[PDB]
Amino acid sequence: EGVEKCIYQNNQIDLLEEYFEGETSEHVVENLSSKTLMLFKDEKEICKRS
Amino acid sequence: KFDDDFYEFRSKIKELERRLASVITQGFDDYDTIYGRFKLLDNFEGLLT
Amino acid sequence: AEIMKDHQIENKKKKEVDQDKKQDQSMYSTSFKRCCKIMERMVVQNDQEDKYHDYRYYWSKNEGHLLPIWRFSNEKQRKKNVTSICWNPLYPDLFAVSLGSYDFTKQRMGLICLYSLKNTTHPEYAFNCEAGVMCLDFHPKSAALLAVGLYDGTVLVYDIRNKHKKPIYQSTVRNQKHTDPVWQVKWNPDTSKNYNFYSISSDGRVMNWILMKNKLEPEEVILLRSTLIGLACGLCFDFNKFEPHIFLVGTEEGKIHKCSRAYSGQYQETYNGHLLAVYKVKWNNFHPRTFISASADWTVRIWDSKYTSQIICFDLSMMVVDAVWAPYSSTVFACATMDKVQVYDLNVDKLNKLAEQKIVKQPKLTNLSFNYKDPILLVGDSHGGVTLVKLSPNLCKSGPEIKQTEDKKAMEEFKNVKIEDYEREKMENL
Amino acid sequence: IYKTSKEIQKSDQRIIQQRVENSIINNQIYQKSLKRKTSKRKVRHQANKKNFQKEMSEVEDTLNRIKTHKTVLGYLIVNSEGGVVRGAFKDEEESKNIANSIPLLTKKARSVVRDLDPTNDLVFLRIQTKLNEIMVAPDDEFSLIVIQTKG
Numbered sequence: 001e002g003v004e005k006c007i008y009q010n011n012q013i014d015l016l017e018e019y020f021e022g023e024t025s026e027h028v029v030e031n032l033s034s035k036t037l038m039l040f041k042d043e044k045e046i047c048k049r050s
Numbered sequence: 051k052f053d054d055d056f057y058e059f060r061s062k063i064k065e066l067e068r069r070l071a072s073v074i075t076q077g078f079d080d081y082d083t084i085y086g087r088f089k090l091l092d093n094f095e096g097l098l099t
Numbered sequence: 100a101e102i103m104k105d106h107q108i109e110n111k112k113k114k115e116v117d118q119d120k121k122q123d124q125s126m127y128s129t130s131f132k133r134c135c136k137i138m139e140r141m142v143v144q145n146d147q148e149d150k151y152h153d154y155r156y157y158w159s160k161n162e163g164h165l166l167p168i169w170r171f172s173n174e175k176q177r178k179k180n181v182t183s184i185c186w187n188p189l190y191p192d193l194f195a196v197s198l199g200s201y202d203f204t205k206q207r208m209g210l211i212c213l214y215s216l217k218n219t220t221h222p223e224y225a226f227n228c229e230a231g232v233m234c235l236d237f238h239p240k241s242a243a244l245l246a247v248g249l250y251d252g253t254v255l256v257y258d259i260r261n262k263h264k265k266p267i268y269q270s271t272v273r274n275q276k277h278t279d280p281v282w283q284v285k286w287n288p289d290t291s292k293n294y295n296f297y298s299i300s301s302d303g304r305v306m307n308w309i310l311m312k313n314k315l316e317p318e319e320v321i322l323l324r325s326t327l328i329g330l331a332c333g334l335c336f337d338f339n340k341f342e343p344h345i346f347l348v349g350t351e352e353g354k355i356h357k358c359s360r361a362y363s364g365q366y367q368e369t370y371n372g373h374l375l376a377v378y379k380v381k382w383n384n385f386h387p388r389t390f391i392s393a394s395a396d397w398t399v400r401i402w403d404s405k406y407t408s409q410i411i412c413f414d415l416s417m418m419v420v421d422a423v424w425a426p427y428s429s430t431v432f433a434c435a436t437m438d439k440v441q442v443y444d445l446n447v448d449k450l451n452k453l454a455e456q457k458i459v460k461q462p463k464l465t466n467l468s469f470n471y472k473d474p475i476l477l478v479g480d481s482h483g484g485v486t487l488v489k490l491s492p493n494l495c496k497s498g499p500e501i502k503q504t505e506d507k508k509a510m511e512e513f514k515n516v517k518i519e520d521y522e523r524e525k526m527e528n529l
Numbered sequence: 530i531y532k533t534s535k536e537i538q539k540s541d542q543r544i545i546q547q548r549v550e551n552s553i554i555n556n557q558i559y560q561k562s563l564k565r566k567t568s569k570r571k572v573r574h575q576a577n578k579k580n581f582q583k584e585m586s587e588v589e590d591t592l593n594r595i596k597t598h599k600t601v602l603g604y605l606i607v608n609s610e611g612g613v614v615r616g617a618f619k620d621e622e623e624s625k626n627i628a629n630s631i632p633l634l635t636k637k638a639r640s641v642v643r644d645l646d647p648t649n650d651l652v653f654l655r656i657q658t659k660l661n662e663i664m665v666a667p668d669d670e671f672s673l674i675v676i677q678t679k680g
Contacts, residue, residue, distance in 0.1 A: 008152070009144075009148060009151065009152065012152070013155075013192065013217055014217075015144060015217055016137055017192075019187075019190055019193050019223065019242075019259070020243055023243070024260060025260050026258075027267075027312075028267070029267065029312060030312065030313055031313050032313070
């Protein structure tokens with residue numbers, strides 16, 4: 001009877017469950033981005049050269 | 051009896067036409083260019099109900 | 100350990116970088132956090148053991164008994180009204196209530212709180228919003244996706260999984276976000292076209308939102324649209340589960356309109372029965388072409404889609420705030436008016452309410468929601484306190500004879516058959 | 530200019546510390562800890578700083594809430610090596626006795642669970658005495674023990 005009483009209290013709610021455990025954010029908006037890595041330019045050329 | 055069928059058929063054509071108006075309007079907004087929208091009109095040129 | 104050495108596949112991770120820092124807050128973070136979370140629930144469980152034992156099985160002839168079990172509220176959030184309430188499809192225990200500010204003239208920030216059944220002391224998830232959240236909804240396919248509607252028509256998409264808690268998506272002037280307030284927001288069940296978001300603004304423009312990558316695309320399903328100035332105001336909208344194309348939208352004017360997704364500019368049918376704005380319109384469960392609408396005028400009316408007038412009208416002296424159908428059985432609904440909540444079963448009584456209760460004496464009830472998994476009703480007070488009341492076992496489906504004819508089909512068919520028989524009786528009377 | 534140079538240096542230091550923080554709100558406990566470790570050249574100021582010694586409300590906030598909860602004598606964290614990371618009890622003798630006696634029982638209790646099934650590991654253990662209820666949550670890094678009088 002005492003063992004049965006303990007069984008009923010635990011049965012009502014799991015109490016250890018973690019909502020959305022493990023699964024990550026999944027889709028997450030990403031902004032497209034551009035990063036200049038370096039600039040190459042001629043030095044002291046007459047006028048300018050395209 | 052045929053006339054009664056025609057009225058039922060008349061409603062079906064209107065339902066078909068109403069759906070076409072919605073899809074046609076969505077396509078026109080989607081192209082976003084005068085040339086693109088015009089091309090869609092040429093395809094449905096003989097499909098106007 | 101020797102077996103792991105024999106087979107060097109997927110070497111154990113969780114490298115011991117840990118937290119360190121020597122003093123002023125070493126460790127106290129992810130495995131330890133789970134133990135602390137479990138410990139908080141266990142301490143709460145021992146104190147609430149008498150209440151928890153009653154909740155699991157207190158077990159509550161035409162009589163109805165409703166008992167409030169727990170009330171969840173915040174002193175800081177007391178100004179905020181309960182407004183929209185929703186339950187996650189994946190977990191019955193997790194339900195989220197988004198606080199909103201009513202009365203129009205007074206406007207304050209609204210906090211969205213998800214209250215897990217395991218811990219009632221404080222919300223499992225807390226969200227801060229610039230304006231009060233008018234409506235909150237959860238996608239059926241994925242529990243994490245959340246739809247939020249706020250003042251100035253802003254549409255907010257939130258993911259429960261994300262730790263940061265910032266809105267996943269937002270609606271802007273370039274995204275054609277609607278003006279005024281989006282009273283009703285819902286998640287489309289179909290996932291073929293990514294994720295579909297349905298929002299009804301106070302201005303009255305049904306908006307369909309499709310989730311994209313770092314962008315949201317809005318499509319107007321219909322326009323509310325008579326010698327009047329401007330578009331008709333719509334306070335609520337609902338989609339029939341049986342047929343996706345047919346959706347019912349309520350209006351401030353007081354005329355409920357049945358709408359079809361295929362015809363943007365056409366109305367399938369219009370109902371002129373209500374004399375005041377209808378706060379909520381919902382299709383009855385287990386049946387098609389039937390729904391219950393709650394309006395500002397204090398009357399509750401049940402209508403048939405084929406008919407142009409409400410089949411049954413219920414008169415309550417207190418103004419009706421909302422009416423919700425029972426998920427477990429058809430012809431069962433709950434209406435909460437001026438601190439009084441009433442549940443009506445057509446089979447049990449033709450007109451008289453089966454049960455009337457007042458969960459909280461001090462505050463008026465902003466809204467009420469129904470749980471599909473168990474017979475528990477959530478009632479939201481004006482102060483933001485949310486109390487869940489478990490319904491009595493007196494009302495149940497297939498009640499003439501217990502376990503008679505052994506029809507598995509009858510649970511989803513006899514309930515559909517029973518409303519038709521009840522509906523036929525109303526036609527004979529009129 | 531020497532003062533100017535110094536100022537510049539300070540600024541540079543500040544920038545390095547930020548990076549991930551990116552200024553704005555005071556934010557984060559983890560970020561602060563990292564900065565202190567790696568570079569100790571500059572500290573404090575920068576922005577509002579929120580509440581002092583409060584990097585994260587959530588584990589710290591939850592522990593404060595359970596202690597504040599009615600009918601709870603206190604919650605004492607036990608270090609994996611028989612140590613008191615944090616003690617919250619009215620009398621030191623009860624806390625000192627709890628700090629050494631309770632972990633030994635849990636380790637013995639964990640083995641009892643362990644003998645029946647090797648794969649199974651202790652997740653939570655609760656011992657209920659005639660006048661008090663003892664709840665202990667065991668993890669390899671830390672152990673949480675809470676004593677709550679039965680209602």
